[PDB]
Amino acid sequence: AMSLENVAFNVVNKGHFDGQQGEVPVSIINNTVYTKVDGVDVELFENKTTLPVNVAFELWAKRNIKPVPEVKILNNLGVDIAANTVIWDYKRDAPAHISTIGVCSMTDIAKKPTETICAPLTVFFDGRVDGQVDLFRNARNGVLITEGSVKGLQPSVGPKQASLNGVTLIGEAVKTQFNYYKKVDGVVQQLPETYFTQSRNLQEFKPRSQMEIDFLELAMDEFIERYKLEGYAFEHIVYGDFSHSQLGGLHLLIGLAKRFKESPFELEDFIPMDSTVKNYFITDAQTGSSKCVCSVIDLLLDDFVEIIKSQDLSVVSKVVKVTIDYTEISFMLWCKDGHVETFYPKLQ
Amino acid sequence: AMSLENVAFNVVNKGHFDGQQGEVPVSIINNTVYTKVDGVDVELFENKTTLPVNVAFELWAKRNIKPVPEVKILNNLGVDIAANTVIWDYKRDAPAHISTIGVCSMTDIAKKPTETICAPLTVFFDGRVDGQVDLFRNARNGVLITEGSVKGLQPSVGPKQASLNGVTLIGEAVKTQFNYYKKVDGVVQQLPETYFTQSRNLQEFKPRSQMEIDFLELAMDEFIERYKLEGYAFEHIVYGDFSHSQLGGLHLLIGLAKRFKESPFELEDFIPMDSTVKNYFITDAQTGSSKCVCSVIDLLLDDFVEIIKSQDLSVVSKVVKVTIDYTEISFMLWCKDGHVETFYPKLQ
Amino acid sequence: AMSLENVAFNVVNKGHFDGQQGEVPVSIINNTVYTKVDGVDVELFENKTTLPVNVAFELWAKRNIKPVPEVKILNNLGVDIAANTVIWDYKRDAPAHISTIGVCSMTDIAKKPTETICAPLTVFFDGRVDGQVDLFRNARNGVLITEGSVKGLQPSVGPKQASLNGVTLIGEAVKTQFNYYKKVDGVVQQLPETYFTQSRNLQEFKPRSQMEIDFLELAMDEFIERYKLEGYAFEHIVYGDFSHSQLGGLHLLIGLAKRFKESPFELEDFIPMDSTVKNYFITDAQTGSSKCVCSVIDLLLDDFVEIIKSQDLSVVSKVVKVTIDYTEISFMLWCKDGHVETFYPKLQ
Amino acid sequence: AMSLENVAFNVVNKGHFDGQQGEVPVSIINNTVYTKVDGVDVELFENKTTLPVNVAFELWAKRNIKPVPEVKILNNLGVDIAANTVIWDYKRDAPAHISTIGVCSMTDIAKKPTETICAPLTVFFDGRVDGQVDLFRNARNGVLITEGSVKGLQPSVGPKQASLNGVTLIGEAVKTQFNYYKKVDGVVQQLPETYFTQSRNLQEFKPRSQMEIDFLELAMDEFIERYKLEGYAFEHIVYGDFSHSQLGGLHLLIGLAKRFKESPFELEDFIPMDSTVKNYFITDAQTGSSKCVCSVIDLLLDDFVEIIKSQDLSVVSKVVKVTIDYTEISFMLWCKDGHVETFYPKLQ
Amino acid sequence: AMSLENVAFNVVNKGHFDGQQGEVPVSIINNTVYTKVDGVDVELFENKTTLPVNVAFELWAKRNIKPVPEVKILNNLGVDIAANTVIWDYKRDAPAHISTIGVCSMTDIAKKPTETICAPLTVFFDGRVDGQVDLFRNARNGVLITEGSVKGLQPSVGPKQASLNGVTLIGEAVKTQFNYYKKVDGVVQQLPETYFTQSRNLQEFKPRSQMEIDFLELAMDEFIERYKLEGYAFEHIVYGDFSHSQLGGLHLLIGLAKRFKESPFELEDFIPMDSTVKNYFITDAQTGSSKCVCSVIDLLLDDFVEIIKSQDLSVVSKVVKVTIDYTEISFMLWCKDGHVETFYPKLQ
Numbered sequence A, B, C, D, E: 001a002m003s004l005e006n007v008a009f010n011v012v013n014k015g016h017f018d019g020q021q022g023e024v025p026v027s028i029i030n031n032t033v034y035t036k037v038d039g040v041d042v043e044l045f046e047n048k049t050t051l052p053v054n055v056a057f058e059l060w061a062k063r064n065i066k067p068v069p070e071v072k073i074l075n076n077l078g079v080d081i082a083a084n085t086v087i088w089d090y091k092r093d094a095p096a097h098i099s100t101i102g103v104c105s106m107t108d109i110a111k112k113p114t115e116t117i118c119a120p121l122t123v124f125f126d127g128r129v130d131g132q133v134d135l136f137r138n139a140r141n142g143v144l145i146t147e148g149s150v151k152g153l154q155p156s157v158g159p160k161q162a163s164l165n166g167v168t169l170i171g172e173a174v175k176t177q178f179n180y181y182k183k184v185d186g187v188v189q190q191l192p193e194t195y196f197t198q199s200r201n202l203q204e205f206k207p208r209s210q211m212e213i214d215f216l217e218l219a220m221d222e223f224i225e226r227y228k229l230e231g232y233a234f235e236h237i238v239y240g241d242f243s244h245s246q247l248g249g250l251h252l253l254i255g256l257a258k259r260f261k262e263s264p265f266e267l268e269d270f271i272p273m274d275s276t277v278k279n280y281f282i283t284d285a286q287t288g289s290s291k292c293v294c295s296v297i298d299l300l301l302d303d304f305v306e307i308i309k310s311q312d313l314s315v316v317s318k319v320v321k322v323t324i325d326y327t328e329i330s331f332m333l334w335c336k337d338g339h340v341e342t343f344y345p346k347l348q
């Protein structure tokens, strides 16, 4: 009994699609959905997707409002479609997946993930929804998230944080750390050992360890001294070199956050999407130091120190592959006379 | 239980809105409504109105598919809104009236024509729908059409032709000639004695009398001779003067139709709408004679001959008011030495 | 002598429509109005309304730039149209009323509010404009605002605050508190006893009483102690319960403001419009506690304490009707053993 | 080396995409692709599809310009995608299939039809392109057209006509009759014995047999007499009954073509697409007889006579399934006292 | 005193911009200009240009309504801009020139053609407008048309036909044949001796000589016999070869018109604009013979016979340059044993 007016009634009365009965008058003008409220049109949704306005409106109304894995994790694990839900990508203002399974008549490829069309796709299953752990067991390809243990399956502990309505957070009143399971061609995969990105903001950055507290509170030379980081190019890589026309280093989000409290800078997100490594065209407002492609990763400073201190510093240029968010991130390690010169998440 | 998907289901399965239950997947992209048919989008409607695409789609689906009065008649009688139907204007590809009464939640000003909001508006009532002759009696303002007599109400016999799905025709299998009634401020108004325009096409023009048959067959000088029209400027007014840079006369549709079989011409409909008098920017392709505003009326040649022969030809310039389609059409009559020079439906 | 180029000249030279003579070159591309300034197009207005771009531009230029009643008050008092002005709704980026009286040729239903078309509509009259108090006296329906007394009419003192160019403020250099008068079918209404919402921001919240200062400065248990609020569920209703997956209470804007200084949260305004009670899909960023429809009202904490302390706490569930902004706001009062459990502005 | 400017260069210089090198300046404004020709923009394509303008432009440029099966045949045979070509649907002004294989980077699901993503889809293969008969053999699902025999494969002789650049024709300088083959889940399927629709126009209708020549020349009673069709309701079914408000019969295109030479009528194609059975909202302009859903099929009158004369006329109502264009078309046969009352392609 | 509402008033009341005073209510929605006529919006203009809707509307209203040179002639003579007029391109539904001189505030580069910005541009001057022959004399670059002689200036007699409101015609009531003059860098240029294209339609083709009358009446072998055209490949070039998959010849519009009366064909105008040589993707509906780029020229058959009979037939391949519409048109002449094989307006 699905309609535009019923999807709109649910948005107006329930804050999202809740399966409630009823209709409100709707008007569509270009890429915006309006509703008549006491004789005047009130905007309900502006389509920022490449889908038809009414189709994107329904998928946004039918989005998952429970803490879900962040889109970068789902992408890294090869998720193609979700089972009976919509993972809304808040960084793109669009659905995270092209098609749906049992959500919207326009985007649905199947009603149940058991349909043979879903067999070659990695379907995302949520153990919190009844019977989805059993659907993962029967699926050929898929990713499963659970809050507890699964019989016969060994889990991969995911990041502490999940996305709740576009807000990335480590839950206190809700569980956000999931057990991850994956299957390729009927075979349960052994998920690799992985670091996780911390998913922090530049403006609301909070340290998550004593090393991170010391990075933000101490001066450059005393932090490098305290943590025995001499010869590891933290001055360039983490702190950033703003002395030349091309901005040097600044590849760790904690370093950008430290810089941000002293002086502002413009970060141009030229590929706006969720990813383990982010690329920004950065312009430092104080110095005028800039970089077209400044790759930034948000690792816990302890995790970054462990990665850089676990490298052989005897090569001039070397690709260093690190598992972050279940994906292989290539870094470029440049050394000279046994000391680091630069270390950055490899661009292009 | 009104929805976009149900309006679309009715269009696809019934050819129009028929109150049938069911939904089809719909996608809206810009001003077009599409439906998924075997995996591909098929266009159902292109919005050419100034209303939101989905609202115009519903009003077009809910259009009256019975022979209805032509929009020019309804306009001439001062109709503002229709009671529980949509009069679709096929000349404008838009609803004939801004608001509705019991049709669409977005355009409705009321559910019943008895609501006090409808009292100041001239509501159109159809005696063919049950209870609408009584709704006219209750209405402060309105126009009523009927197929027979309404006890006590003095009728006006309307035009022989009506519009059935955009096709103007004099019915054979259907009744297209109605009795017309009107009320202004609770008082039944006496509709004037009127001529009716014939509503013919230039390309499919058919004569509707022996005078009209003779006009199209006989040469100019022998038709004027046979019908004693010497001194009535038919050579200028009806036939048209193509000898100078400004096209002379050509104000009767029959004259344009006669011209059309010999040589083509461009008629630019710069105000595209239904009206008793039409204005065209005409360019004769053979001679290059043209006129920016050439007013054209489609009167039966007998009715035009009766109007011109009933005039006093002793004045230089005089306004001649003639009742055509219930409205007062002003003509400009120019005479010299007791003979007509020109007679044309007056501009501005 | 109204034109798009003259409306644009006034915007460019006067900051708004001021009746000045002159024209500037204008270009319209989609929903944006541009002007040529030294060979380059400069954006003057982006249409966010459901009206044609040029019509919305003219109504926005012709908006009232004096402190006017907030749209929620006008809506609550049943205002349909304004007399010879445009009340711009800054929360919707659109005109507050569909039609105008003596403002714009496209939206005008009349030139003067004395026209019989305006008689059934509640016309808003401004006593500050010459002769508008007399127009209210002669109008069948209407709402009048004055700065002083009206002969023969008893006033209803409105809120201290008004909207000046979208900025809600209690005037110091301008008068913002008006005397309100209303007429229904020629009869001056006795406006009801009413509380007013304070119209404050979450980010710029300022206390307006010693109880409000104490709420923000004291801890939960000592404020509840000082003001004898034990058993009134302020911990749930005003302070908010962030311990479970569903956010508990948080229905008073002062409580959201207190929370906001400690930790941020996402308030999704899913029906963006001016209203006495606002609905938000709230997600607490610290805990992950969330609520799809969290109704929020901005009452002075003293006014809310007076409302809750004036209730009978012997019923399990009861609707409590309170007059706020001249409208009847239904609250849901839930009690147990003579104590409040919850009290919230009733949703749907 | 694919680009918008190269696709545009090919359209301008080759009449379509021909793999030629070069670029022309392009501008995209809304849904139209323009090119600069001597300082002025010349329209190259107007997007009437639900795809992005530049993507639809590339697929239209890359359309198959050889005689191809008509879209109704491809749909009836279950074709989902074409192998390394674009079948352009000229009835919809859009690609016949959503995705492509080796055509456009935006719509491509694969580069070669051998990719496992294509395995569940019925891929269309053209034996006229090198290596495509072998790609059919490797394909799990597919439809193959050939000009000659494929060793081992049992052929289906298809329709005489094919679509060459939107023009449906029976080839003289080109081969338009193909051998058809189909595979479902690796197994070559035996295509049924079928009738073919003739794909004729109402305005350019030409008879294709002596019975069809006699239908258009002879009067109703003498054609029915000559071909022994008494009691087969041809008067209703083929000729059409225009005496009542609902148009009776008129389900054969030849009957509509015969009617068309005497008097015009409106055929509203409310689902504009290629199909074996077409549905029209028909309004006869002469009588005013109309039908919301008038199903029309273009069978050779001999083929229709053979179908109706092969039926048992002893049942009141019966569904008659006939294979037309490889699909099963259900007809509704209504009889009384051993004679036909009506026979029509069944609706819904 | 220029405005959108005044331009709209002129269109409604004068059929075009006539400098009349007054305003009508206008609404702009997307690319369409509407006007309120008795409470409903009536479309006045649909923007098919790459200019802003209101700017294109003003230029279309301000178009030249006198017979003007066809856009192909103006392009061939290098015209960049017109002096104080708009040449409307009816083949493109857009202004023929990007900028204006004294027409529209948005498109104007100058008010008078004497401004130094116009000096490098070839300005079009009309001797029928007062003072424009003197403005040509002052102009550094320009093209001038006149009806009579200009003392001292050596004339070029132009084509007999001109475009009057989009209708190409040889005038009878108006003068359409002009004297042409041109200036490049202050120097009056001698216009070459030229042939003129006839500017005829395929559907309304009329012969303009006894050779053209004989081409359309006589069979191929007797026309070729009568006019001694043996060995000149008229069978291929003019008549067309429809026997192979690639359509042979068919480069003269008279040959396409002769073919058109026997059987229809699709002519795809892939570069829709006015030009001396037109390119079409042609598909013969009878045979299925087609050609992606079929260059077509409309020369008087006598003029084409004179061109082909004035060539040396002793070379295998040779470029033949012919002056048509003041421009140099290259033809490709292919011979064998002293006879023509093909002759076509050269592509790219």
Ligand SMILES: Cc1cc([C@@H]2CCCN2S(C)(=O)=O)no1
Pocket: B160, B161, B170, B171, B172, B173, B174, B175, B176, B177
């Ligand atoms: C029912 C019905 C009535 C008609 C009549 C008789 C024939 C002409 N018309 S009319 C007066 O134009 O509407 N046709 O069907």
Ligand SMILES: Cc1cc([C@@H]2CCCN2S(C)(=O)=O)no1
Pocket: D160, D161, D170, D171, D172, D173, D174, D175, D176, D177
């Ligand atoms: C090559 C080629 C083959 C054809 C044949 C022969 C003539 C009719 N056709 S057909 C069977 O309809 O496609 N034409 O060119």
Ligand SMILES: Cc1cc([C@@H]2CCCN2S(C)(=O)=O)no1
Pocket: E160, E161, E170, E171, E172, E173, E174, E175, E176, E177
């Ligand atoms: C004034 C005027 C002049 C013309 C002339 C005479 C008739 C043909 N033409 S022309 C040479 O083609 O333009 N018509 O009106």
Ligand SMILES: Cc1cc([C@H]2CCCN2S(C)(=O)=O)no1
Pocket: A160, A170, A171, A172, A173, A174, A175, A176, A177
């Ligand atoms: C159940 C449940 C768990 C949680 C939170 C609280 C702290 C730990 N986690 S977790 C692992 O990060 O998601 N809240 O409810």
Ligand SMILES: Cc1cc([C@H]2CCCN2S(C)(=O)=O)no1
Pocket: C160, C170, C171, C172, C173, C174, C175, C176, C177
């Ligand atoms: C006159 C006038 C009044 C005001 C302000 C100042 C303080 C009180 N008010 S009010 C009642 O809130 O609007 N300013 O000018």
